[PDB]
């Protein structure tokens, strides 16, 4: 059954609530983003209205086969009326097509649902600038001070420089990047760009990337593996076993692999700066774990909430243990005391 922190008081709306069968009283189901934890339950057999971004809508149609008549895309940054209620979709800085949803309730209440997000100072100049939020439904994935990691830009710099140096030293090296879901596309795109290559991949992954509205995409990606020196593979193949296997299929083209495994936060960020990171090596294979996060750091999340000044906060992640719940409530009170709201 659908939990409380996925319902929208005083509307017939839910958010990311597709795995609980028919929800009692729901006339419209919002989807924040095309990630399996959130879309879980949607298929060709779904027959209620689904409201989402255009990008999320292209994925629902082509990958999940949801019938066109039930897909309702909305533009960003635009006041829209749905079933008699004003709503706005805002860029969540998460994966392609991900949004936060602002709801203007009939009773004068204003609710912001962040879905999954990476808070950014640029959000302080969105349609949120105007106005008050009574309830904030917050992605608390990394709500503890120990969670630190670099900017996306620093991680991409590191990856571009590492791949360019290795390929310039050895024109016979192949670059491999691991993937599982959408998001983090900049890692393989930026590497392929610096090397003058298209990204090679499976037919299923090419199909997925074609739904994303990336300008110039036909020029950047291909299913012809033999013409590309940057290959995408499923994340679970990014190990010495998997990579050796892959290298045998390439027909004596390459004598080295350098591979990249994008992760979220790991404990090594406590101690090692991005510039100082080093790979795991076995023979002519090397594997770099890189901390490319699409969720807020603690510092990022704190800045956004202290700016927003919401009246109440309801966490949507780490809500399963008393200790987690308690710890989050303690941070929300410090932030409020420090900033004066
Ligand atoms: Ni997500």
From Swiss-Prot:
Taxonomic superkingdom: Eukaryota
Organs and tissues of expression: Expressed in brain, heart, kidney, liver, pancreas, placenta and skeletal muscle.
Compartments it resides in: Nucleus
Transmembrane segments: none
Expression triggers: During mitosis. The mRNA encoding this protein contains an internal ribosome entry site (IRES) in its 5'-UTR. This 5'-UTR generally suppresses translation while specifically promoting expression during mitosis, when cap-dependent translation may be impaired.
Subunit structure: Binds constitutively to TP53BP1. Binds CDC27, which is itself a component of the anaphase promoting complex (APC). Binds PIAS1.
Family as reported in the entry's similarity comment: Belongs to the DNA repair metallo-beta-lactamase (DRMBL) family.
Function comment: May be required for DNA interstrand cross-link repair. Also required for checkpoint mediated cell cycle arrest in early prophase in response to mitotic spindle poisons. Possesses beta-lactamase activity, catalyzing the hydrolysis of penicillin G and nitrocefin. Exhibits no activity towards other beta-lactam antibiotic classes including cephalosporins (cefotaxime) and carbapenems (imipenem).
Name the record gives this protein: DNA cross-link repair 1A protein
Name of the coding gene: DCLRE1A
Span covered, complete protein: 700 to 1040 of 1040
